[PDB]
Design a protein around this ligand. Structure first.
Ligand code: F3S
Ligand code: F3S
Lengths: 58, 58
């Protein structure tokens, strides 16, 4: 499944690109995965758009 | 890791009991796991307190 690692810089590109799969935590300093088994094509876009390369498939 | 399945009834007991691990999604109808690898003891409490038995360890 999809995970956000500790390299997250809170860029929030993933939230803008794929809102159905990524949300920011309450603190607002790390993205959260709402559906870790998503097949949406925006997932690939979010991974490719993360500067921190924080989004991975485990 | 910890997951919330589709049986979630949005009881939000998990959010009250272990706020560092569970948050509600934006719609507010499903809990989200902020740290799926957490070892906090409140995780066990949240699992035990979920009426829907929606929280599991995969
Ligand atoms: S830095 Fe974090 S907020 Fe999203 S764009 Fe990369 S996972
Ligand atoms: S119903 Fe859902 S909101 Fe939490 S208490 Fe059970 S996982």
């Amino acid at each position: 499944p999809i995970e956000v690692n500790d390299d997250c810089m809170a860029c929030e590109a993933c939230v803008e690109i794929c809102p159905d799969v990524f949300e920011m935590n309450e603190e607002g300093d790390k993205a959260v995965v709402i559906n870790p088994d998503s097949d949406l094509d925006c997932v690939e876009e979010a991974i490719d758009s993360c500067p921190a390369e924080a989004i991975v498939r485990s």
